[PDB]
């Protein structure tokens, strides 16, 4: 009953932790994309201004 409730709450908590971490992972992938794009945009500006 009590250690049982612990089993249940541990399980539920674990589900929640996986959820949070997964959200963070996807968000960071989006970050990767945008960072790369903006970085090459920046180099292009620097060169074409050096022009």
């Amino acid at each position: 009953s009590l250690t049982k409730q612990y089993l249940s709450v541990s399980n539920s908590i674990d589900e929640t932790v996986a959820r949070y971490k997964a959200q963070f992972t996807q968000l960071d992938t989006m970050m990767s994309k945008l960072n790369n794009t903006s970085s090459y945009l920046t180099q292009q500006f620097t060169a074409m201004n050096k022009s």
């Binding site: 945009l41 292009q44 500006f45 074409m48």
Partner: protein, 49 residues
């Protein structure tokens, strides 16, 4: 939705840079041709006498 707004709103730096270059050049060339044009009539003045 952020991406969609970016499409509708955000500009393209590459295109705009090429545009600015073209504009600067047209302006400089215009100034020069104006300099040449101002002179044109003075060939007349040689016939003042």
């Amino acid at each position: 939705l952020t991406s969609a707004r970016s499409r509708i709103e955000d500009s393209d730096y590459a295109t705009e840079v090429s545009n600015m270059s073209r504009a600067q050049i047209l302006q400089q060339a215009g100034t020069s041709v104006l300099a040449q044009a101002n002179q044109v009539p003075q060939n007349v003045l040689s016939l003042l006498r």
